[PDB]
Amino acid sequence: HMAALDSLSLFTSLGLSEQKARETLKNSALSAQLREAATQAQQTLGSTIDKATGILLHGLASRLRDTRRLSFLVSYIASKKIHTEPQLSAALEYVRSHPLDPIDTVDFERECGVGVIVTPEQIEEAVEAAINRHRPQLLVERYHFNMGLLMGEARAVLKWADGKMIKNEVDMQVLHLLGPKLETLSLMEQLRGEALKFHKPGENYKTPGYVVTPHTMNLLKQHLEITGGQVRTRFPPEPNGILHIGHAKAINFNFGYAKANNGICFLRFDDTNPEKEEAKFFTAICDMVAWLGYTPYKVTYASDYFDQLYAWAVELIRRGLAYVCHQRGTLPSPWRDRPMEESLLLFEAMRKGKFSEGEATLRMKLVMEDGKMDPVAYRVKYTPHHRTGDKWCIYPTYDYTHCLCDSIEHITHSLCTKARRSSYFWLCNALDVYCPVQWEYGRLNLHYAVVSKRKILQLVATGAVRDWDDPRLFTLTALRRRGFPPEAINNFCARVGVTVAQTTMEPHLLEACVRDVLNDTAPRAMAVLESLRVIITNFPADIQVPNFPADETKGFHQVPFAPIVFIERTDFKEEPEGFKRRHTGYVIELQHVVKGPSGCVESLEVTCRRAPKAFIHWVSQPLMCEVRLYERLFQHKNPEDPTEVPGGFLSDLNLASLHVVDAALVDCSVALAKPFDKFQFERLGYFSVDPDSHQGKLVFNRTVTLKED
């Protein structure tokens, strides 16, 4: 057992510093009581004892004067019910009073936060507030400020929070403020660092391929001064870009890996190219990231660093590892061995705009894994930049940029899709700057989509699709418009995600996942498109329909009671072929059947067979509501790109697409509905609200059916 160890080895087994366990022996009473509290700890814990639990049992033994209740308090500390110093400071005083031993648990449990949970977010906020409330004293005193006050204010807002975990939140938020002291399984478990064989911060040198300069060890030391050894990771789209289903992996894998490991994640916009702002798209990205549930620590642009980048470029030239070249459109350069002072001149000259676009170039002097020669660092572009305007007329290339930017931001894990990889390390080592580690997930793609913004922006100009928002597509903004719940997409990658390689999937698998949650997260109602009036032999003359069939704990809807209800022209037949032709009330037998010109069936008539087999869906006093039902955009599920022989990218287009509705009869339960808050028609399946629906002229998108087969 544990009740069989020398007092000193028991006390270290509860995780006390020996020098504290030495001190503790001397106290023959504390010692002999702690010891007992530890025996009957695991007489009811059945195992070896957690070291976190340890400092509590020590705390308990050292303060509890009322020996009688020791058996009682241990039991609450053993079954982690009590697990923090204020909880125990509380229960201890609860027992300094309440001397009589009925000791109602409930009164007790309530006044010691036995059930309480305290989310990180709540601590973030409590310290964030605390800091703000002192921000300018804290910026001037810096590390000579009284960090005690920050913990204090933080405390008195979170009574039962782990005193340590507050400090950690303080230590960090302060660091970000002041800078360096320059003296199928689960998801956030799937993405935990130790569950992936990802390197721990500050230990880049353990990863495969990592080069170690005589600086690396001091560069990592600085790194660690600057980040406190936090997981830092990026996500780097173009500002005028379009996000598509694939990026849901990118996003999740970057913000996820941070969120899963107390990390932080920059959203860094790759704006190295001077374009104009198609604002439609830029905002679409900040949204879509939020919409999938993540909050960027900070939003940076690469333009933010043109200064630093340029300066480093110059430092490449000095190390004779880059040069200015005058070629055009890999044939070797006459200019790669030109002297350093010459490249220095013309780079500056290139900056002062003495060279027309492409009359000159800065190339890095090397040959890469795949035999590519002297890739280009800096080109000359004269279009004005969206953020630095016309300050610069030379700009870094992607290769050069999103490698050094990772160094400037001390990215710890630079994640990217799957080529010539160790050309990554090349820069950061040539300049002896901190050097992040690159791991590569691979390439999620789905069978039936075209996502090249080029090819997409001409499905919107060739009226094949309504907008870049169009549900037909797989742009995130589109699936959002099809009312796909974020949680689904996030669960999607949960079931099928690691760094696989170009594991491009077939769509229906996703919509398994979209529905598994729409089944629980979307209430129900009724409606049909091919409608028909149904009069009837008189009835009694407000029925009441379910929220969620499988469980009623949610509180049912409000329907109306009228005898002229409507129903689908696709349930009522003349000659049964057994198909049929209610969801609430009676049966209502067909007495009279109409007709008009032709064989058109103008109306109907029903009996009162209230009180077998096919029931149905129906709607009295209905609301007039547009609906769009969509069919797959591209005929060839397989890559619509010349993969097989289509010979056309705009050729494999099933001209079907979408079929407009009536403005059909719909249930009144779905009246106070804003966009995107989809529920279920018990008929065909799941639809969702389009952003065209006012309170009056409502509209819906057919999201997904109820099976496949």
UniProtKB/Swiss-Prot annotation:
Keywords: Acetylation, Aminoacyl-tRNA synthetase, ATP-binding, Cytoplasm, Disease variant, Epilepsy, Ligase, Nucleotide-binding, Phosphoprotein, Primary microcephaly, Protein biosynthesis. The keyword Nucleotide-binding applies. Highly expressed in fetal cerebral cortex, particularly in the ventricular zone, inner subventricular zone, outer subventricular zone, and cortical plate. It catalyses: tRNA(Gln) + L-glutamine + ATP = L-glutaminyl-tRNA(Gln) + AMP + diphosphate. Its EC number is 6.1.1.18. The modification N-acetylalanine is found at A3. SUPFAM superfamilies: Nucleotidylyl transferase, Ribosomal protein L25-like. GO terms for cellular component: aminoacyl-tRNA synthetase multienzyme complex; cytoplasm; cytosol; mitochondrial matrix; protein-containing complex. One of its GO terms (biological process) is negative regulation of DNA-templated transcription. Pfam families: tRNA-synt_1c, tRNA-synt_1c_C, tRNA-synt_1c_C2, tRNA_synt_1c_R1, tRNA_synt_1c_R2. InterPro entries: aa-tRNA-synth_I_CS (IPR001412), Gln-tRNA-synth (IPR004514), Gln-tRNA-synth_Ib_RNA-bd_2 (IPR007638), Gln-tRNA-synth_Ib_RNA-bd_N (IPR007639), Gln-tRNA-synth_Ib_RNA-bd_N_1 (IPR042558), Gln-tRNA-synth_Ib_RNA-bd_N_2 (IPR042559), Gln/Glu-tRNA_Ligase (IPR050132), Glu/Gln-tRNA-synth (IPR000924). It comes from the Eukaryota. Monomer. Part of a multisubunit complex that groups tRNA ligases for Arg (RARS1), Asp (DARS1), Gln (QARS1), Ile (IARS1), Leu (LARS1), Lys (KARS1), Met (MARS1) the bifunctional ligase for Glu and Pro (EPRS1) and the auxiliary subunits AIMP1/p43, AIMP2/p38 and EEF1E1/p18. Interacts with RARS1. Part of a complex composed of RARS1, QARS1 and AIMP1. Glutamine--tRNA ligase. Plays a critical role in brain development. PANTHER family: GLUTAMINE--TRNA LIGASE, GLUTAMINE-TRNA LIGASE. This is Glutamine--tRNA ligase. It comes from Homo sapiens. The gene is QARS1.
